[PDB]
Symmetry: D2
Subunit: 211 residues, 4 copies
């Protein structure tokens, strides 16, 4: 018996227009319905090829399919964090509080310095990718990392707490080439409650999904 677990597109936690004016309904719709859906589809396509190989039903270029899986699986995972990382202005935006504020102050000095560091990491991704805030479980610290594509430069075992997508399709329709203004405006929709919930799990030595 051989099984693979398949992936599905999660619904947004809010309406397509809920993050306006900071991210347009048009972007939200395309980004979720087309781009995120495509990564779910691609991940499942790679799994089907692997399962067929595991069954002894077909051959496989192992490198090619695992490269494909890594790309799409990561697109799916990062977007799945990205949506609840944001919230309509009110629930979204402003400064953090609770444990996340304290830990940000601890490792980065202040929220202002963290904001600068995270923004600069996002603005300076070469090509397409992400800025992420992770909890590194080995020495138990917050780190900012750049991710290229969806799958390059992750820290093994690390838990993603906050993710900012700087693929051109995350902003181009509204901001055009001005990724900087997009990054700066995105702070207005950060759902700190979600980031806090992720950090709480991470601090307890747990995987920070499925809140």
């Amino acid at each position: 018996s051989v099984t693979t677990k398949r992936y599905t597109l999660p619904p947004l936690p809010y309406a397509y227009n809920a993050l306006e004016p900071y991210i347009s309904a048009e972007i939200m719709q395309l980004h979720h319905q087309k781009h995120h859906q495509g990564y779910v589809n691609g991940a499942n396509a790679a799994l089907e090829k692997l399962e067929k190989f595991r069954k002894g039903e077909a051959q496989i270029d192992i490198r090619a399919v695992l490269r494909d899986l890594s790309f799409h699986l990561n697109g799916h995972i990062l977007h799945s964090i990205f949506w609840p990382n944001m919230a309509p202005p009110g629930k979204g935006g402003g400064k953090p509080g609770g444990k996340i504020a304290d830990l940000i102050n601890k490792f980065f000095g202040s929220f202002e310095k963290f904001k600068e560091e995270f923004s600069q990491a996002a603005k300076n991704v070469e090509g397409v990718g992400w800025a992420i805030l992770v909890y590194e479980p080995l020495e138990e610290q917050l780190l900012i990392l750049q991710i290229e594509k969806h799958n390059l430069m992750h820290a093994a075992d690390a838990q993603v707490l906050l993710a900012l997508d700087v693929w051109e399709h995350a902003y181009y329709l509204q901001y055009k080439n001005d990724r900087g203004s997009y990054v700066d405006n995105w702070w207005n929709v950060v759902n700190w409650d979600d980031v806090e919930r992720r950090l709480q799990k991470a601090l307890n030595g747990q995987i920070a999904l499925k809140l």
Copy 2:
């Protein structure tokens, strides 16, 4: 107030010659004292630059330093797993048992198919890198991934259970260009108890470290 947590070289769980003749005493000594040491130093060097930056003390090429951090931090994590992943012949090397055996059977059909898929993965790494078995927490399944260098193609949030280093320095002194037979002999030193300990943590929703 700014802090960063620094990394340290862990001792091997055994002697340098404990994995002989499957992997050389010379390789063990160089691999750990020189190669793994380098990654610790590299990670700490990156942290210093970030810490200095966070204090508004110096400037930074944030892309460069985060690239450096990603490479070296991953070097340090993967090797930190790699050593206890192995055990002296007898204690190490056999067929899996418990939950790891059953889940391997569930997703791959048999241990034989898994062993084939994992070996194909390790032998077909383009350039230097790793073959890894992860627990993927989103749909809760085992996956094999190829890693290039130390930091390319990880699955975000996923827990590393088993890792094989196929960087040339992991084998060349003993096996020369013959990576295939190095991968083949490595099975004889696999510590299935360690992998089981990591899988149980992952199943618990915990980080597969510290145990």
Copy 3:
């Protein structure tokens, strides 16, 4: 005495709206005035850092600056080919003639199959990048390659004859996520005379950039 030669943005060979309706004037303006200009600026910035190093005037993270140079210099070179690779419909579009048609038939069987393979390569670039047709001088043959970002997967010494940009900024404002329709519409503006001129140089074992 230390010198570096600096790069400059070439003017377009036609008006911004000359490729309508296949590529909008809005895209052409941003793509040239912002995106291409940025690569020129980035390549010159990396050179100034290298020049300061060569003067013994400043220290340098050599890996970082050389990665930066490679990215930007390639962005500049590929865009510099991209623009004259296209022409207003009439001069642009249709099927190739002369030596290019013959060599396409020799290596690909027909212009139909070539166009199929080139379009598929473009559509299937993972993340951002290019499809290119090159002359490979060592064994003297046409090859299609996928380029990721601007600088990943080029053939050393090979001459670029035809280049198609599939970075999202090349099409997103007009075609949104539908890269496939962008790729298909682009054939209508291909400047075959320019491709022929490049092939003519490459066939004599010449560098095929400046004619």
Copy 4:
């Protein structure tokens, strides 16, 4: 009619032990007979898959195959330049003369400054790769570039004049982890005559191969 031109392994210009004590006989033999042969084999295997698709004979993962082709073709091209780039001690490996010396002085200030930049580039390659010196035809200057694997970070259209392999298999049997002393010692075998012939070709606007 569909054709692909296939590749072949070139003989070394000298005996395996001809570069001792700087690069060992054992290394020269494995490096050429095993590693370089593998790249020739891989390039032809990829071309066979492409040829089969062009005839409409089989389906293809165009991204996978073109990735494979890029890696192995570049392996083959760079190793082909690598061997004649070197010569037995004395018989070639001191300081450059003629045009190569003049342009090195022009762009790097002096040979000593060039040597430092080239050495530093090679020593600071992350993972496996190359340091190369290229003639960049757009602004007609010399540049040093780092290459990762065989195919990452080349400059489109540029002509490779000098290549230094820093893949681990290029030095590990003799130098172990000490890549630095290998890079330092390689200068004793550089064939500046070969480099000069490549430069003159690039200056003529020719591809820097076949002589």
